[PDB]
Amino acid sequence: ADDATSQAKAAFDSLTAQATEMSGYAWALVVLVVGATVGIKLFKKFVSRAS
Amino acid sequence: ADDATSQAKAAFDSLTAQATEMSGYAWALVVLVVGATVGIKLFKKFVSRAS
Amino acid sequence: ADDATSQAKAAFDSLTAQATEMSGYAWALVVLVVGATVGIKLFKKFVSRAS
Amino acid sequence: ADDATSQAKAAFDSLTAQATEMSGYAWALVVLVVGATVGIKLFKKFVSRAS
Amino acid sequence: ADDATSQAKAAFDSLTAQATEMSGYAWALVVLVVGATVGIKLFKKFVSRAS
Amino acid sequence: ADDATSQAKAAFDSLTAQATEMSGYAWALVVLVVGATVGIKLFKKFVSRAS
Amino acid sequence: ADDATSQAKAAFDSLTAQATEMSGYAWALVVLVVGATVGIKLFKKFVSRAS
Amino acid sequence: ADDATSQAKAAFDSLTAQATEMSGYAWALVVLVVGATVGIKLFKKFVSRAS
Amino acid sequence: ADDATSQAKAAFDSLTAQATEMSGYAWALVVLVVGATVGIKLFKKFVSRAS
Amino acid sequence: ADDATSQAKAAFDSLTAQATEMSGYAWALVVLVVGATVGIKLFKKFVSRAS
Amino acid sequence: ADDATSQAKAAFDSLTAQATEMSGYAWALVVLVVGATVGIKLFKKFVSRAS
Amino acid sequence: ADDATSQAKAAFDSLTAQATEMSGYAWALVVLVVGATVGIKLFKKFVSRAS
Amino acid sequence: ADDATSQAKAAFDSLTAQATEMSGYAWALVVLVVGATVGIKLFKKFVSRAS
Amino acid sequence: ADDATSQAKAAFDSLTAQATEMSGYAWALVVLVVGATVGIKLFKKFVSRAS
Amino acid sequence: ADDATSQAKAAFDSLTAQATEMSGYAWALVVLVVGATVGIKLFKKFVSRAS
């Protein structure tokens, strides 16, 4: 049934938009972990600069 | 009956085209998960580059 | 389900705020290690100044 | 019988709402396992930051 | 059955509280491994400070 | 399916152009860290020149 | 059926050529990540050269 | 019938030779995926060598 | 089962006490490597003092 | 028959208590595999600590 | 059957004692790899001590 | 199949010769980085010679 | 059938000898990657020796 | 028939001894795969030791 | 099976003796790299002695 594939198609479009919403939180979580590594690694840069 | 196999043949062609439509959504869903892994893994590349 | 993505969204916001709380302790721990390197490296500066 | 399909339809709506209730507990259980991985993996981030 | 989903719901709440109890031991085990890395990595800091 | 490989090919070209955009920010971030090392290391050059 | 293995053979040749097309994009994506590591790591080489 | 087992025996020999033909394409498909992993993993080896 | 979580809890307490016993040997091993660096680096201090 | 469901009920209670006895051995077997991973992974921690 | 669970219980006790025998060889194999890392890493310590 | 191991053997010989071709570029890339360190480090030798 | 286990035994001996032939190529492939790391890492040794 | 269970019992003892003969080849096949992982992983240990 | 653990035990003893043979080559390879660092670093000692 091609009417059957219309029901499955609309639900797969809602599930892939759910994947872009959760993946958007994955870009923002690695935003805050990379903010920790840039701050901390500049602290170690000052360690070697005064050494 | 060979007329019987004509009815079964046309319905199996509609069901295999339904499999290419749903499989097209499977290529696009793994498009958005691989966009999450390329973005996030370049975030971890900047972590090691400043380290 | 889009109601399903509302439950996952609120729990991912609590987990990313948990990442900023623990990362705040990572800035303060590298605060105290960089205080050790600035103090000690000024001790070595006095070594070369009297030499 | 189309009256037969009315009895089957109402029981399949109760069974699919049962699937959203149990699946809601599956989002919350993976909420608490992902809270374990974000906490623990920030502990390993502090390991490499002091190293 | 909605009475069936009441039995499954209460057992899934006990299983998710079991996941928070075991995950609490995972935060404490990575507490003691991170205590090893902070102690040992301050030993290596004294190595470079006297060098 | 070769039509399937056309959908995957266009999304892999967008993901590799995303890798050149993020990698461009990695060249600019190491631009500013190398500006810190050239400035600071010329400060230490003046230390030895007056010594 | 050996005619059956002729249909399966031609479709497996199209699927393995699809694997060489996607794998060609994997060589080019690691081309651009290795261009980021050669550029950035020469930036760190200039850091140690002026130090 | 032992004449019956002669008809079944010859068709099972054609089906097992069909399994060696398709399995030959499985060795060649994992040939091209392992060519992707050897190329790409030598790209990551150059990443660490210049680091 | 909450009786199941009692068996898992007692074995995780024995495994975390095993982590403090092995980590105690990690503090003592870096004790003897830091004794090598303090002795040897005072040898290099006498090198520069007579120079 | 409701007397029939009394015979089936008592045998299903003995079979579910058999499932808790065998599952108790599954918690203890993963006790000894997790003791192997905590011991061995602290061995690798000493590898990186002396490095 | 509870006699059935007696046969399964004794065989699961022999299989978990087999897991402690093989895991004992895993502690000894990581004994010899950690002996390689302590020896070799003291060789690199002498490299930096004479430098 | 031993004919199966003949197909896998010839493709593993082509993949290991691919590893010697890419590794040859790794010797030449570290040729040009070591040319940078020998040139630059002789520049610093002239710094101390005129000092 | 014990005659059945004779047919399975001889084919499992040919499959395990196939595993030693492919594993022999795995020792030789890591031969050429370790030749890249010994050559390149002696290039970095000359970098620090002239520094 | 209890004479019927004597015929079934002797054939199940021959089938379980067939399972120990084939499982003996499974211990020896994972013997040769674990010999590949111990050899190759010591090759990677020498990679990090010279690095 | 305890006879099964006898086959696995003897193969794990051969694999751990293979780890001591390869690790013996790791002590000798770091023998020759430490001979390079002792020779070269005494060359730099003569540089400062005539300065």
Cβ A46–C23 below 8 Å, yes or no?
no
Chain centroid to CA J50: how far? 36
Cα–Cα distance measured from residue E39 to residue C33, given in angstroms and rounded to the nearest whole number? 12
Long-range contact pairs involving F12-21 (C-beta distance under 8 Å, separation at least 24): F12/G22, F12/G25, F12/G29, F13/G25, F15/B34, F15/B35, F15/B38, F15/G29, F16/G25, F16/G28, F16/G29, F16/G32, F18/B35, F18/B38, F18/B39, F19/B38, F19/B42, F19/G29, F19/G32, F19/G33, F20/G32
Q: Tokens at residue G17, please?
A: 């050529």
The residues of B whose Cβ lies within 8 A of any Cβ of F are: 20, 23-24, 27-28, 31, 34-35, 38-39, 42-43, 45-46, 49-50
Q: Tokens at residue A49, please?
A: 């600069």
For residue K29, give the nearest of O16, O38, O41 by CB distance. Answer: O16
Cα–Cα distance measured from residue A18 to residue O29, given in angstroms and rounded to the nearest whole number? 54
Of L31, N46, A38, whose CA–CA distance to O21 is shortest?
N46
3 state SS of C20? helix
The answer to whether residues B45 and F26 touch, using CB atoms and an 8 Å cutoff, is: yes
Cα–Cα distance measured from residue K2 to residue J16, given in angstroms and rounded to the nearest whole number? 11
Q: Which residue of chain J comes nearest to E32, CA vs CA?
A: J42
Task: Name every chain I residue with its beta carbon within 8 A of the beta carbon of E28.
Answer: 16
Which chains form contacts with chain E, at 3 or more CB pairs under 8 Å? C, D, I, J
For residue E50, give the nearest of I5, I8, I37 by CB distance. Answer: I37
Cα–Cα distance measured from residue E9 to residue F10, given in angstroms and rounded to the nearest whole number? 45
Question: For chain A, what is the HEC assignment?
Answer: CHHHHHHHHHHHHHHHHHHHHHHHHHHHHHHHHHHHHHHHHHHHHHHHHHC
Of M36, G31, N43, G33, whose CA–CA distance to L28 is shortest?
M36
Of D34, N44, B45, O42, whose CA–CA distance to C19 is shortest?
D34
Cβ A2–B14 below 8 Å, yes or no?
yes
C-alpha separations of L51 from C51, F51, L44, N4, O45 in Å: 17, 11, 11, 104, 18
Q: How far is B31 from chain F (nearest CA, A)?
A: 6
Which chains form contacts with chain F, at 3 or more CB pairs under 8 Å? A, B, G
Task: Report the b/e string of L33-50 with b at 16+ CB within 10 A.
Answer: bbeebeebbeeeeeeeee
Chain centroid to CA L11: how far? 23
Cβ D43–E26 below 8 Å, yes or no?
no
Q: Write the DSSP string, J4-36.
A: HHHHHHHHHHHHHHHHHHHHHHHHHHHHHHHHH
Q: What is the DSSP letter of M41?
A: H
The answer to whether residues I41 and E51 touch, using CB atoms and an 8 Å cutoff, is: yes
Burial bucket for residue E40 (CB in 10 Å: 0-12, 13-18, 19+): buried
Cβ O33–M45 below 8 Å, yes or no?
yes
The answer to whether residues K51 and O41 touch, using CB atoms and an 8 Å cutoff, is: yes
Task: Name every chain C residue with its beta carbon within 8 A of the beta carbon of E38.
Answer: 29
Q: Tokens at residue O21, please?
A: 């043979």
Cβ O33–N50 below 8 Å, yes or no?
yes
Cα–Cα distance measured from residue D3 to residue G42, given in angstroms and rounded to the nearest whole number? 77
Task: Name every chain L residue with its beta carbon within 8 A of the beta carbon of H28.
Answer: 7, 11
C-alpha separations of C29 from D50, E38, E45, E46, N18 in Å: 8, 10, 14, 17, 62
Cβ O15–N24 below 8 Å, yes or no?
no
Of A26, E21, I13, whose CA–CA distance to D38 is shortest?
A26
The answer to whether residues B49 and F30 touch, using CB atoms and an 8 Å cutoff, is: yes
Q: What is the DSSP letter of I1?
A: -
Cβ D32–E41 below 8 Å, yes or no?
no
Task: Name every chain M residue with its beta carbon within 8 A of the beta carbon of O40.
Answer: 49
Q: Which residue of chain H comes nearest to M42, CA vs CA?
A: H49
Neighbours of G32 (CB within 10 A): 15
Neighbours of B8 (CB within 10 A): 11
Of M21, G9, H21, G24, whose CA–CA distance to L10 is shortest?
M21
Q: Tokens at residue I39, please?
A: 């002795």
Q: How far is M9 from chain L (nearest CA, A)?
A: 14
The answer to whether residues C21 and D40 touch, using CB atoms and an 8 Å cutoff, is: no
Cα–Cα distance measured from residue G11 to residue F3, given in angstroms and rounded to the nearest whole number? 13
The answer to whether residues L33 and H50 touch, using CB atoms and an 8 Å cutoff, is: yes
Cα–Cα distance measured from residue D29 to residue E9, given in angstroms and rounded to the nearest whole number? 12
Cβ L37–M51 below 8 Å, yes or no?
yes
Q: Write the DSSP string, D1-51.
A: -HHHHHHHHHHHHHHHHHHHHHHHHHHHHHHHHHHHHHHHHHHHHHHHHH-
Cα–Cα distance measured from residue K23 to residue M13, given in angstroms and rounded to the nearest whole number? 28
The answer to whether residues K32 and O20 touch, using CB atoms and an 8 Å cutoff, is: yes
Chain centroid to CA D25: how far? 5
The answer to whether residues G33 and H39 touch, using CB atoms and an 8 Å cutoff, is: no
Q: Tokens at residue J2, please?
A: 């409701």
The H or E element containing residue N16 is: helix N2-50
Q: What is the dihedral of CA J25, J31, J33, J38, to 10 degrees?
A: 180
CB-side neighbour CA atoms (13 Å) of H13: 6
For residue J39, give the nearest of K16, K27, K42 by CB distance. Answer: K27
Task: Report the b/e string of E6-34 with b at 16+ CB within 10 A.
Answer: eeeeeebeeebebbeebbebbeebbeebb
Cβ C15–D27 below 8 Å, yes or no?
no
Q: Tokens at residue K42, please?
A: 């003291």
How many residue pairs bridge chain H and chain M with CB atoms within 8 Å of each other?
6
For residue M46, give the nearest of L13, L16, L34 by CB distance. Answer: L34
Q: How far apart are the first and last CA of chain F?
A: 74
The answer to whether residues L16 and M32 touch, using CB atoms and an 8 Å cutoff, is: yes
Q: What are the backbone dihedrals phi and psi of residue F17, each rounded to the nearest 5 degrees, phi first? A: -60, -35
